[PDB]
Design a protein around this ligand. Structure first.
Ligand code: FCO
Ligand code: F3S
Ligand code: F3S
Ligand code: F3S
Ligand code: F3S
Ligand code: F3S
Ligand code: F3S
Ligand SMILES: [Mg+2]
Ligand code: 3NI
Lengths: 513, 59, 322, 322
C-alpha cells in the first residue's frame, strides 16, 4: 500500500511522508520537505554579518541555535577573540533555547500523539489522554506554558526570543547586569522546580542524572510513586506498554557536532580547535564505533533533492540552485531537503542521525576531558535496547536535567565585571565554520566571506541530516530508515509515521531554509 | 527629448559662458564643500570644544 | 471563534513567539477565550487526510472560519505556481486564496506574511510576498482591495517575529467583543501597538536625547544609544517593543542590540547589503542618512549639536551597570 | 541565610510589593533560595512569646542573623523613647539597635526605613527616621558609621514601596554567591537598580526630548511627558521603574502618573506642600524650578527651546492610543 501523508504536521514546517506498507509495516519511506525559502541564496552578496539576522529566521524554535553557530562562523572566519563571559552567555542562551524546546516540543508536538486511538486498549491510555491531550492535557498545559521560561532567560541576555541577533563576532551585544543574572537564575530554578523536577521527573535533576544504565532508568521509574507517575516515568511506561520502544530505530549511526564551549578553551575560535573546546562533545557514532567529528567530512547530496547538482559538495563549496519540483520529480527528486552525508572511513558517505540521541552517544565516547560531557547512559541504552522512538525521546528529555545543570553553573560562572565583547576586525576575506547542537542536533554554517561580502553561505541543519532524502547511492536518510519497519495500524491515521518523524523533533523550516 | 533640451541650453552662448565661469571657480566650490565635509567630520570635536568653553563659563 | 493558522514561507518564529504568550498564555487563549484553534501546523493534532478535511471544510465554507492566521510568506515561485510551498496537496498560495476568501478576519502574523519579510529579500528565490503587501507596496498576494468577510483588510501583525501580545491581545479583543476597538494604521497594523516607536520606552532614549552613542557591543552597551553607531532603527520603527517588553523581560535595544526595524515593511532594511548590518549609514561620516521619523536632517542635526553641548555628565557614563 | 524582617513605622507596602515578587516569587525565594525567613510580622507563624523567643535569640546572638530587613521608620517619639512603636515588649527602635548590631547584613526596605519617608514628613509626630539616613542626611537612627557584621552599611532599597525585584534580586545575589557584585551608591542603594533614572525607559522620554507636555490627566496622558505640568521627578530620580516594570506591567510614568521621586531620600519632595502635588513648580511660569539631574537651567532651557522648534509632528499627538 502506497500511503502519502500530507501534511505530517507538528514538525515545524511542511512535511509530506510517502510510505510503502506491506503487511501493516512500512517497507520504504520518502520524506518530502515541501517548502523552500532559499536563505542561502539570499545571503549571497549580503553583509558578512547578515547571517546573524537571516539565519535565526531559518527557524523560530531553534533560531537562537542558528544565531549561535552563525556567530561562531563569523568568529572563526574573522579569527575573533571571545571573552569568557561572551562564551558563557552564548552557551546559556543556546542551552536555554534547547530547554524551551524540550518541553514545548514534547508536549505540543510529540506527546499529543500518545492520545491516539490506536492506544485506546492500553491500560495507561486514559492517563495518557488526561496528561497529553492537546491544549487540555494536565501535563500539556503546564509543560507548554512553562516552556516559555528558559527563553525568558534568553531574552534577558539577548533582548528577546525568538529573533535576537545579539551573538556577534567577538562576543555578545549585551552587557548583563547583576539583576539580569539573578533573574535568569531565578527563572531557571523556577522552571526546573516547576516543570523539570516536579512534572517531568518527579525527582531532582541530580537523581535523574544518577541513571547510568537502562536498568538504572527502569529502577528509577519503579523507585517511588513520584518518579513512577512523573511525565518521564509515565512516558517510559507508556512507551514500553504501547511499543514505542519497538520501532523508529533508524540508522543507528549518529552525528553530533557538539556545542557549549568551555570559555577558556575557545577564546579564539578556530575550526581546528573547536572539538577540544566543546563541553557537549562532538562525535560520530558509526558502525558501533566512535569517530571524531570533522566538518571536512560533511557533504550535501542533491540527487533526490530539488536542487541542481551532480556530486556531493562540501558546504564550503556548497550550492543551492533550486530546480522546479515538477522537473525534479521527473528526475526522481522528491524533497527540498538536501541529503547531508558524512564520510566515515570504511563506510563511505553515510547518513548520520542527528539530535539528542546523537549527542548522548557522543557523550558516551571515551577520553572526555574534564569540561566535557561524559555520560555512559545512552551507550548502555543503545547496547541494551537500541534506538527507537522511545530511546530517541528519552535522549531528548535526558538533556533537560543535564543542560539545566550546565546553565545554572554557567550563570554562576559569569564574571559580571569582565568583558562580554572584543571588537573584532571585520576582515574582507574569511572562511568560517560555526557549529552548535540545536535542540534537534548538529547545526552548522559554512561561510565564505569575500570582498567584505558573503561569497558563500551554506547551512546544514540537524533535520536536514535526519530527514534529508536518499543520496546518490539511494541510501535512505535517518528518518526515512527510521520510518521503515514502523507498524501502521491505521492508514487513515498513520500516527506511527508521526511518532517516528516527531521523535526526531523534525524541523522542516530548518531542514530546507 | 527633454535631455536633448538641456544639451540645447548648454549650447546657449550665455548659459555656456556662466557654466564656464562656474568651472573656472570649481576649485573654490570644491574647497568650500571639502571645508564643509571637514567641519561636519569634526563636528563632534567642535561640539566638545563648545562644551569645554561653556563648562568654563559655568565654573 | 474558529481559528485556522497556516504557515507559508515561515520559520514558525511567530508561532514560537505566540507560544511565549502570557496574559493570556497560549493554552488559556486557545481554551478559555472561546477561540477554537481548528488547526495549526505546529500544534494541530490532525495529519494527512484528516487535516486536509479540516482545511477543505474551511475553504469551501462547510464550516465557519472566523480567523485565518497566516504566518510566513505567500510563496509564488516557481513561475507563479507556488510549488516551492506545497501544503496538503496544493500550493500554499491556493490555500491562502481560498481561506482568506473564507475567513471573517485574516491576520498576517510576522513580516513574512504581512510584507514578504526576509524571504522576499532579493533575489527572492521563493517568489515570496505578503498577504496584502510586498514590502511597503500595498497589494501583496491578495491585492490591495482584498477584504475579509468582516470587511477588514488583512490585519498585519508585523515583527520578525511578532511579539506574542501583538496577536494575543488582538485575539482577546476579538474574543471579548472589542473588535471595534481595534484601529489599523496605513500598514494595517494595530495602532494599539504600532503608534509608538521601538524607541518609545527604550532605556537609551536619554542617551539619544543627548546624542550619546553606544560605541561598542558588550560592556559598551552599558551606556549610550545604538542609533549613531549601530544603525538602531528604533526612532524610525513603529512598535511597542519597549512598551510591552519581549518575553516580559527586555527588548533588543534595552539589551544593546539595535532595533532592525522589523515591524516596518521594508525589513530587512537595505536588504542587509554590505555595510548596513549593525551600522549607521552616515553622510560625511557624521550625519545619519536616516533621521528619526518626522524630523529633517537640518533640525535633527542642529538639535543634536545643541544636545551634545547640553549633555549632562551621567549621559556620558555607564548607566546599565552590574 | 536567616532573614528577620521587622516593621517599624511601616505601612507594610514594601512587604506587599515584595509578595508581588516574580522570578523569583516570594515563596520560591523563601524556600528554594536557602533564605530562612525566621519571622516577618505579616508572614511569620509565631506569635507572642514564641515570636519573642525568635527575636531575642537573634538579638543576643543565640542564633545567627544573616539578613535583618527593616521596613518602616525607626519611631523615636515620644521624647526619644520610641513608645509610639512598641513591638514585642520593647520600643521597636531598641529591637532595631539589637538586631542591626547582630545581623550580617542590614537591609532597609522602603523610604521609611531608608530615609524616614512619609512618616518623617513634618511635623513628624512619630519622631520617625531611617536606619542610616534622615532624608538625604546620612546617619539616621544607627549613625553614619554603622556597619553590619559583613562590613556593609545599611543596604537602602528605597521606594515607597520598593519594587519586589529591588529586594528579591539583592536577596538572590546574596543567596547565589554574588554579594560581591552588589555595589551601593552614596545613598547605599544598589547601583544595579539606582544608576538609571525613573525616566530611563519611560515611554514618554521622546516627548520629554521634544519638550511636549502632557496637558491633562486621563486621555491627556495618551501623549506628552509629565515633567512640565505634573511635576514628574523622573529625570531627577534614580530608579529602574521604567527598566524593571512594576507588577511586570507598567510604571507610574507610563500610566500617566508623575514620578514622585520616591526612591530619592527627600521623598515626599517638598513635603507635599500646597501647590507641589502633581504640579511642576516653575519660575516665571515657564522655567521649571528643578531641571533634570546633571543639567543647568540655561543649557536645559536652551536645548528645550531648540527641541520645541524642531519637534516632529508625532511628538505633538496621541501615541498611547486605544
Ligand atoms: N534544533 C533545531 Fe533547527 C533543526 N533541525 C536547527 O538547527
Ligand atoms: S519570525 Fe519567521 S515566519 Fe517570517 S516574520 Fe520572521 S522569518
Ligand atoms: S533610544 Fe533606543 S530605540 Fe534605538 S535609537 Fe537609541 S537605542
Ligand atoms: S527589530 Fe523588531 S522586535 Fe522590536 S526592537 Fe525593532 S521592532
Ligand atoms: S510603602 Fe509603606 S513602609 Fe514606608 S516606604 Fe512607603 S510608607
Ligand atoms: S519622560 Fe517619563 S519619567 Fe517623567 S519626566 Fe517625562 S514622564
Ligand atoms: S515615585 Fe517611585 S516607584 Fe518609581 S516611578 Fe517614581 S521612583
Ligand atoms: Mg543548507
Ligand atoms: Ni528549527
Amino acid at each position: 500500500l502506497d500511503l502519502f501523508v500530507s501534511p505530517l504536521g507538528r514538525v515545524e514546517g511542511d512535511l509530506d511522508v510517502r510510505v510503502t506498507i506491506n503487511d501493516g509495516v512500512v517497507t520504504s519511506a520518502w520524506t518530502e520537505a515541501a517548502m523552500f525559502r532559499g536563505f542561502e541564496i539570499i545571503l549571497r552578496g549580503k553583509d558578512p554579518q547578515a547571517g546573524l539576522i537571516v539565519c535565526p529566521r531559518i527557524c523560530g524554535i531553534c533560531g537562537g541555535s542558528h544565531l549561535y553557530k552563525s556567530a561562531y562562523a563569523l568568529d572563526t572566519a574573522w579569527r575573533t577573540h571571545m571573552p569568557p563571559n561572551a562564551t558563557l552567555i552564548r552557551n546559556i542562551c543556546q542551552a536555554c533555547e534547547t530547554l524551551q524546546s524540550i518541553p514545548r516540543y514534547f508536549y505540543a508536538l510529540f506527546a499529543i500523539d500518545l492520545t491516539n486511538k490506536n492506544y485506546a486498549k492500553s491500560k495507561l491510555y486514559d492517563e495518557a489522554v488526561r496528561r497529553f491531550a492537546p491544549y487540555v492535557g494536565t501535563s500539556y498545559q503546564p509543560g507548554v506554558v512553562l516552556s516559555a521560561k528558559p527563553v525568558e532567560v534568553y531574552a534577558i541576555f539577548g533582548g528577546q526570543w525568538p529573533x535576537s541577533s545579539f551573538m556577534v563576532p567577538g562576543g555578545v551585544m549585551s552587557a548583563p547586569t547583576l539583576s539580569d543574572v539573578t533573574r535568569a537564575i531565578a527563572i531557571l530554578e523556577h522552571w526546573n522546580d516547576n516543570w523539570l523536577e516536579k512534572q517531568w521527573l518527579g525527582c531532582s535533576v541530580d537523581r535523574w542524572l544518577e541513571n547510568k544504565t537502562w536498568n538504572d532508568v527502569l529502577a528509577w521509574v519503579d523507585e517511588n510513586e513520584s518518579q513512577y507517575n512523573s511525565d518521564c516515568g509515565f512516558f517510559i511506561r507508556y512507551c514500553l506498554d504501547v511499543g514505542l520502544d519497538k520501532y523508529g530505530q533508524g540508522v543507528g549511526n549518529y552525528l553530533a557536532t557538539g556545542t557549549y564551549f568551555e570559555p577558556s578553551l575557545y577564546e579564539n575560535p578556530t575550526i581546528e580547535g573547536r572539538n577540544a573546546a566543546l563541553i557537549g562533545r562532538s562525535g560520530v557514532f558509526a558502525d558501533g564505533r566512535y569517530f571524531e567529528f570533522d566538518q571536512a567530512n560533511v557533504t550535501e547530496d542533491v540527487t533526490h533533492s530539488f536542487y541542481e547538482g551532480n556530486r556531493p559538495l562540501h558546504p564550503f563549496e556548497g550550492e543551492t540552485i533550486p530546480v522546479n519540483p515538477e522537473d525534479g520529480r521527473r528526475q526522481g527528486k522528491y524533497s527540498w531537503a538536501k541529503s547531508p552525508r558524512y564520510a566515515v572511513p570504511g563506510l563511505g558517505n553515510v547518513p548520520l542521525e542527528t539530535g539528542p540521541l546523537a549527542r548522548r552517544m557522543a557523550a558516551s565516547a571515551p577520553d572526555a576531558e574534564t569540561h566535557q560531557d561524559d555520560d555512559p547512559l545512552f551507550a548502555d541504552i543503545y547496547n541494551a535496547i537500541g534506538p527507537s522512538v522511545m530511546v530517541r525521546q528519552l535522549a531528548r528529555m535526558h538533556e533537560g536535567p543535564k543542560y539545566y545543570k550546565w546553565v545554572r553553573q554557567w550563570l554562576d560562572d559569569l564574571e559580571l565585571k569582565e568583558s562580554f565583547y572584543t571588537k573584532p576586525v571585520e576582515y574582507a576575506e574569511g572562511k568560517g565554520f560555526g557549529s552548535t547542537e540545536a535542540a534537534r542536533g548538529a547545526l552548522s554554517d559554512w561561510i565564505v566571506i569575500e570582498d567584505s561580502k558573503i561569497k558563500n553561505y551554506q547551512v546544514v541543519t540537524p533535520t536536514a541530516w535526519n530527514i534529508g532524502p536518499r543520496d546518490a547511492s539511494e541510501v535512505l536518510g535517518p528518518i526515512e530508515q527510521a520510518l521503515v519497519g514502523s507498524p501502521i495500524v491505521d492508514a487513515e491515521d498513520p500516527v506511527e509515521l508521526g511518532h517516528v518523524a516527531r521523535s526526531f523533533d523534525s524541523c522542516l523550516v530548518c531542514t530546507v531554509h | 527629448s527633454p535631455v536633448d533640451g538641456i544639451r540645447r541650453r548648454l549650447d546657449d552662448p550665455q548659459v555656456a559662458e556662466a557654466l564656464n565661469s562656474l568651472l573656472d571657480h570649481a576649485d573654490l566650490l570644491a574647497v568650500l564643500v571639502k571645508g564643509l565635509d571637514g567641519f561636519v567630520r569634526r563636528g563632534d570635536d567642535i561640539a566638545n570644544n563648545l562644551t569645554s568653553a561653556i563648562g568654563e563659563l559655568k565654573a | 471563534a474558529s481559528v485556522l493558522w497556516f504557515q507559508g514561507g515561515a520559520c514558525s518564529g511567530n508561532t514560537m513567539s505566540f507560544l511565549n504568550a502570557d496574559e493570556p498564555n497560549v493554552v488559556d487563549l486557545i481554551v478559555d477565550f472561546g477561540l477554537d484553534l481548528l488547526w495549526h501546523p505546529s500544534l494541530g493534532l490532525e495529519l494527512g487526510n484528516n487535516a486536509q478535511k479540516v482545511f477543505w471544510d474551511c475553504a469551501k465554507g462547510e464550516r465557519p472560519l472566523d480567523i485565518f492566521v497566516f504566518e510566513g510568506t505567500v510563496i509564488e515561485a516557481p513561475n507563479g505556481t507556488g510549488q516551492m510551498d506545497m501544503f496538503a496537496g496544493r500550493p500554499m498560495k491556493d490555500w491562502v486564496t481560498d481561506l482568506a476568501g473564507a475567513a471573517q478576519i485574516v491576520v498576517a502574523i510576522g513580516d513574512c506574511a504581512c510584507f514578504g519579510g526576509i524571504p522576499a529579500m532579493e533575489p527572492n528565490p521563493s517568489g515570496s510576498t505578503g498577504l496584502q503587501f510586498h514590502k511597503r507596496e500595498k497589494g501583496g498576494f491578495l491585492g490591495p482591495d482584498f477584504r475579509s468577510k468582516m470587511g477588514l483588510p488583512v490585519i498585519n501583525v508585523p515583527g520578525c517575529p511578532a511579539h506574542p501580545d501583538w496577536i494575543t491581545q488582538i485575539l482577546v479583543a476579538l474574543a471579548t467583543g472589542r473588535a471595534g476597538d481595534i484601529t489599523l494604521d496605513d500598514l494595517h497594523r494595530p495602532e494599539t501597538f504600532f503608534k509608538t516607536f521601538t524607541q518609545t520606552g527604550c532605556t537609551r532614549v536619554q542617551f539619544f536625547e543627548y546624542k550619546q552613542s553606544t560605541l561598542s557591543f558588550g560592556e559598551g552597551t552599558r551606556t549610550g544609544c545604538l542609533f549613531y553607531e549601530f544603525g538602531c532603527r528604533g526612532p524610525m520603527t513603529h512598535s511597542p517593543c519597549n512598551r510591552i517588553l519581549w518575553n516580559r523581560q527586555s527588548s533588543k535595544t534595552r539589551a544593546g542590540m539595535p532595533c532592525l526595524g522589523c515591524t516596518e515593511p521594508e525589513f530587512p532594511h537595505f536588504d542587509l547589503a554590505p555595510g548596513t548590518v549593525f551600522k549607521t549609514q552616515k553622510v560625511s561620516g557624521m550625519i545619519p542618512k536616516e533621521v528619526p521619523e518626522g524630523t529633517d536632517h537640518l533640525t535633527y542635526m542642529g538639535l543634536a549639536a545643541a544636545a551634545r553641548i547640553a549633555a549632562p555628565q551621567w549621559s556620558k557614563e555607564d548607566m546599565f551597570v552590574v
